[PDB]
Design a protein that fits this description.
Largest sheet: 7 strands, mixed
Order of helices and strands: EHEHEHHEEEEHEHHEHEHEEHHEHEH
Name: Bacterial extracellular solute-binding family protein
Number of domains: 1
Keywords: ABC transporter, transport protein
Oligomer: monomer
Assembly: monomeric
Entry title: The crystal structure of an ABC transporter periplasmic binding protein YdcS from Escherichia coli BW25113
Structural class: alpha/beta
PDB class: transport protein
Number of strands: 14
Number of helices: 13
Distance between the termini: 49 Å
Strand content: 15-25%
């Protein structure tokens, strides 16, 4: 096979665009022209899926969130990188450049890519005044159109969703002492599972594929759900009556890092991709498309698609308020580990 001639990337949906969805949105064609390297994207919609794909092998890069990145480093599935081989490294936002989700033991395990929030997405005809609370997806109630929310709301099918419910519980039962929603004592955890068991009766579908989630908002009567800004952008661009809010209990979110597989076949293309991904126009264009935020602050002014006000609107100043995804760890028995999150969330989703 032609050497350094391809690049196999695992990515969130929409993260790698080549102008085939929308001509205007393209940060792959120019890279392929200049490098001679065919970029192959495998899309995945949970960090658990990305962890499994990396473990299996065959991919050069992954755009891992924090609830995958440390799992990949500790599994030695990603290799540390030499940041001096990435000339754009000095343009990274100081808020991400030394993040402990990819800096471990003095080594750098990838290049930051984008970050953003998990928002409350909702139908603006059912909610002519925007909702201000996650309670519309957690607690059975009549919505502003007179009808119950039961069967008309969704929840994310990744077990990391427990952290969302932890933020809801933190706000509505502050006496439990929840602070970090990823590090829950047994008593706090069980309170969150009880809320999720109650939410289950309302759930129309636990969403995973973004196109399927979008079809439910268009064709299956679903009017409220956590989502990424990407899905909101896509429904909006189709003329659907959909918007997003930052609810009063706060939000989770994600900081994503392009990380190099330990056995990568095309490391030279991979390093070229990582440097290319930090160029300011790419950074802004991806933030425009996905509704995320660039990790290169120059990207906030380098993309007309993003616009002058896009970084502010997308939440560039909200960084310190997001509960970013990370893997729950036991810390010697003090907190409930992610293995139990996975078991228990799978059981709740099944009515079990």
């Amino acid at each position: 096979d032609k050497p350094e001639g391809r690049l196999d990337i695992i990515a969130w949906p929409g993260y790698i665009e080549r102008g085939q969805t929308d001509k205007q949105y393209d940060w792959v064609t120019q890279f392929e022209k200049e490098t001679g390297c065919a970029v192959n994207v495998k899309t995945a919609a949970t960090s658990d899926e990305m962890v499994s794909l990396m473990t299996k092998g065959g991919y050069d890069l992954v755009t891992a969130s924090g609830d995958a990145s440390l799992r990949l480093i500790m599994g030695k599935r990603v290799q540390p990188i030499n940041t001096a081989l990435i000339p754009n490294w000095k343009t990274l936002d100081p808020r991400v450049v030394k993040g402990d989700w990819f800096n471990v033991g003095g080594k750098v395990y990838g290049t930051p890519y984008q970050w953003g929030p998990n928002l409350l997405m909702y139908n603006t005809k059912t909610f002519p005044t925007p909702p201000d609370s996650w309670q519309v997806v957690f607690v059975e109630q009549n919505l502003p159109d007179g009808k119950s929310n039961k069967g008309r709301v969704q929840a994310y099918d990744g077990p990391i969703y427990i952290a969302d419910a932890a933020l809801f519980v933190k706000a509505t039962q502050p006496q439990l002492g929840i602070s970090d929603p990823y590090q829950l004592t047994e008593e706090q955890y069980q309170a969150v599972l009880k809320v999720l068991r109650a939410q289950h009766s309302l759930i129309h579908r636990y969403w995973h594929d973004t196109t399927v989630q979008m079809s439910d908002f268009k064709n299956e009567g679903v009017v409220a759900s956590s989502a990424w800004p990407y899905q909101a952008n896509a429904l909006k661009a189709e003329g659907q009556p959909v918007a997003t809010v930052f609810p009063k209990e706060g939000v989770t979110g994600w900081a994503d890092t392009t990380m190099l597989h330990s056995e990568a076949k095309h490391p030279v293309c991979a390093y070229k991709w990582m440097n290319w991904s930090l160029t300011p126009k790419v950074q802004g264009d991806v933030a425009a498309w996905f509704g995320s935020l660039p990790v290169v602050p120059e990207g906030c002014k380098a993309s007309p698609l993003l616009g002058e006000k896009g970084c502010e609107t997308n939440g560039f100043n909200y960084f310190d308020k997001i509960a970013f995804w990370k893997t729950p760890i036991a810390e010697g028995g003090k907190f409930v580990p992610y293995s139990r999150w996975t078991q228990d969330y799978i059981a709740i989703m099944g009515g079990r």
